[PDB]
Design a protein around this ligand. Structure first.
Ligand SMILES: CCCCCCCCCCCCCCCCCC(=O)OC[C@H](COP(=O)(O)OCCN)OC(=O)CCCCCCCCCCCCCCCCC
Ligand SMILES: CCCCCCCCCCC[C@H](O)CC(=O)SCCNC(=O)CCNC(=O)[C@H](O)C(C)(C)COP(=O)(O)O
Ligand code: SF4
Ligand code: SF4
Ligand code: SF4
Lengths: 176, 85, 115, 155, 115
């Protein structure tokens, strides 16, 4: 089906042309605009008071990455090396090494924030939910260097936002 | 004053040895470009850029492949401009 | 195999014929481009540079290839005279920012392990 | 003493400079539409005291927002040049930060800082509107911690 | 006494207001900073060319139109004359001729100026 959008039939009776002349002479349609915006002013605004109040978000939010650890506290990461293999920007660099215990985890988990694109594929890639990416978005900076996150930086951030992301995946893993 | 054949000669040779890679001692009436003057085919695309600014004219490419020696330039301007002495 | 299509020129003779007047255009423009682009180089080094890129590929025999650089080289003289390119786009040919690359065998050996 | 007087004078200039900057978003890519989104009534930069001003001879901070290519490279620098002082550039998004998703392509310079002196790096792909709003807030905090008049006093 | 004094005060107010807007900000202009801004790209050398006729044509029509309205400023005192009928006829003449000049200018293209 379809419908026309500009087939207009201006009736040429003496009545109708009076409105058309009234429209042109007295700026009726322009006055419609004035009363239109006036009604908008007489309405409330919707400007949220940042940072005293921020935008509404969702448990599935993708933000800043943070490596987590088990309830025991050992790092979930086992260097399966899936995340960099799917990482569409190759922002994840990592090299595994033997460990003293034999639970040979990685000596390197460096995610370049200025190369990464926050698809969240790393979360889906990780079979042990080691690399998740938290709800934080305030991690701005002034020098390009501090965005080259390293294994220590992710571990510290994971220990920081651990209170938040733990509940987020708690309320979202059923969907995943 | 019509541009004389000798005037064609001296003007043609003048800027020809103002060109960098032409030596005025080696320059002469029979100053063949590639053999005597030691130029190349594309080197010839310099001195035709250099003769143009003398008399304020233009010449095509259909002749640029036949003026290999200063007399060839000198006679060519004489006939095409139709000015003699 | 040997029999092939004349993209624009049958014979190497008319290949230079396309090189000639294009060089004439690529000879004439130097005073005006150096003027309005507001550079610092002199006209003469512009002139002899024009020779330089006319030189490196002055070694091919296939008529199609040479006249393909003819249209290839035809494709910047207007990109310049209609001020489409930038000052950074024609100083790029005047390679200046890099230190002189090494020529002698000793210099390569000193710098690193790369031919 | 003179130190106290110059401290007040520096603060007086400081307060306006951190509250009257007029950004010029050099709209490049999907990062740019987000900056128009934080122009929406939801965030409304202008409530802070900043207005989207063109003619970058009027603007104070300029925002690169999106990927930056070699074709865009020389013109973008010139925008930075005749941009009057004080001038600050904020890197919007991963692509402007460090090339981002196209960091390896043949046509985009890896990171915008290779062309201009980036002041604030804002991560994101795209950075959510209020994340940039946070970055602008960081700019004013950094603007608050300057010693222009103080340095001249010891100069 | 007060009239040019009022004129005098404003001009000094303006001049000092720009004076403390010029020396105070500690001018630190460079060559690229003072370079003309042309949508962020290179200027090709301009603003020294004629602009057809339409801008000139409207200016002359405005000038001619401004001259006729100049003839009809004294109407408020003209209404206070003793012979209104002559004044009523004469003032109507200026307006209808002002109309006629507009009428011709409209009919023979005119206000639809060149493109
Ligand atoms: C009281 C009793 C009488 C009542 C009125 C009766 C006469 C009505 C005449 C209506 C106008 C003429 C006819 C018409 O419809 O003309 C339309 C046409 C539109 O012109 P345009 O918009 O430019 O488009 C075409 C050209 N491109 O128009 C034209 O092209 C004409 C342009 C004319 C320009 C000058 C018009 C007059 C300007 C104001 C004059 C002063 C006020 C009136 C004085 C009247 C004195 C008698
Ligand atoms: C400022 C600068 C901006 C940038 C300016 C850039 C200027 C334009 C460059 C365009 C590309 C190229 O260099 C020149 C082209 O047009 S096509 C290829 C020429 N290749 C050949 O012709 C191979 C065969 N060789 C010969 O035919 C002769 O060797 C020759 C006639 C060349 C010289 O003759 P000699 O030897 O006698
Ligand atoms: S979201 Fe994860 S997988 Fe995707 S680019 Fe960023 S680090 Fe790599
Ligand atoms: S973080 Fe997860 S996906 Fe990445 S290497 Fe470690 S175990 Fe593998
Ligand atoms: S950083 Fe991401 S959102 Fe921003 S321009 Fe690049 S790809 Fe687009």
């Amino acid at each position: 089906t379809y419908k026309f959008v500009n087939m207009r039939e201006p009736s040429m009776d003496m009545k109708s042309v009076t409105d058309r002349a009234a429209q042109t002479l007295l700026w009726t349609e322009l006055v419609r605009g004035l009363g239109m915006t006036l009604s908008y002013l007489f309405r409330e605004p919707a400007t949220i008071n940042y940072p005293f109040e921020k935008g509404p978000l969702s448990p599935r939010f993708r933000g800043e990455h943070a490596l987590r650890r088990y309830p025991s506290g050992e790092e979930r990461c086992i260097a399966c090396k899936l995340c960099e293999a799917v990482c569409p920007a190759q922002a994840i660099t990592i090299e595994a090494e033997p460990r003293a215990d034999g639970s040979r985890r990685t000596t390197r988990y460096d995610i370049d924030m200025t190369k990464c694109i926050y698809c969240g594929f790393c979360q889906e890639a990780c079979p042990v939910d080691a690399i998740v990416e938290g709800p934080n978005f305030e991690f701005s900076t002034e020098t390009h260097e501090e965005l080259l996150y390293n294994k220590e930086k992710l571990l510290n951030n994971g220990d920081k936002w651990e209170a938040e992301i733990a509940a987020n995946i708690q309320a979202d893993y059923l969907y995943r | 004053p019509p541009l004389t054949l000798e005037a064609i000669k001296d003007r043609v040779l003048y800027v020809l040895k103002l060109y960098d890679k032409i030596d005025p001692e080696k320059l002469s009436v029979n100053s063949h470009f590639m053999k005597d003057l030691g130029l190349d085919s594309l080197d010839q695309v310099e001195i035709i850029m250099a003769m143009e600014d003398e008399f304020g004219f233009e010449i095509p490419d259909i002749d640029a492949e036949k003026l290999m020696c200063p007399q060839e330039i000198v006679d060519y301007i004489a006939d095409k401009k139709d000015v003699y002495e | 195999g040997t029999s092939v299509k004349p993209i624009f020129s049958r014979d190497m003779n008319e290949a230079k014929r396309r090189v000639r007047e294009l060089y004439r255009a690529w000879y004439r423009e130097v005073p005006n481009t150096v003027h309005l682009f507001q550079l610092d180089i002199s006209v003469k080094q512009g002139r002899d540079k024009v020779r330089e890129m006319f030189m490196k590929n002055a070694h091919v025999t296939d008529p199609r290839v040479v006249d393909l650089l003819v249209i290839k080289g035809k494709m910047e003289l207007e990109e310049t005279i209609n001020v489409w390119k930038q000052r950074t786009h024609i100083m790029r040919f005047f390679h200046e920012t890099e230190a002189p690359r090494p020529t002698d065998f000793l210099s390569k050996f000193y710098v690193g392990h790369d031919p | 003493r003179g130190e106290y007087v110059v401290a007040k004078l520096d603060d007086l200039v400081n307060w306006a400079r951190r509250s009257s900057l007029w950004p010029m978003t050099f709209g490049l890519a999907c990062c740019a539409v987000e900056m128009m989104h934080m122009a929406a009534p939801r965030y409304d930069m202008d409530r802070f005291g900043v207005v989207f001003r063109a003619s970058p001879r009027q603007s104070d901070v300029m925002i690169v927002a999106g990927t930056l290519t070699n074709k865009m490279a020389p013109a973008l620098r010139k925008v930075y040049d005749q941009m009057p002082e004080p001038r600050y550039v904020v890197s919007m998004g991963s692509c402007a930060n460090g090339g981002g998703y196209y960091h390896y392509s043949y046509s985009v310079v890896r990171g915008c800082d290779r062309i201009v002196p980036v002041d604030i790096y804002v991560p994101g792909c795209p950075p959510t509107a209020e994340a940039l709003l946070y970055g602008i807030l960081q700019l004013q905090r950094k603007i608050k911690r300057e010693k222009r008049l103080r340095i001249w006093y010891r100069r | 006494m007060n009239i040019m004094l009022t004129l005098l005060t404003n001009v000094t107010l303006a001049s000092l207001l720009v004076l403390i807007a010029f020396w105070l900000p500690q001018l630190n202009a460079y060559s690229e900073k003072t370079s003309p801004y042309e949508c962020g790209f290179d200027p090709m050398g301009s603003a020294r060319l004629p602009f057809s006729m339409k801008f000139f044509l409207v200016a002359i029509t405005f000038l001619l139109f401004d001259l006729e309205i100049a003839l009809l400023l004294p109407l408020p005192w003209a209404s206070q004359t003793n012979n209104l009928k002559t004044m009523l006829t004469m003032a109507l003449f200026l307006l209808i001729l002002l109309a006629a000049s507009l009428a011709y200018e409209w009919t023979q293209k005119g206000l639809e100026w060149a493109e």
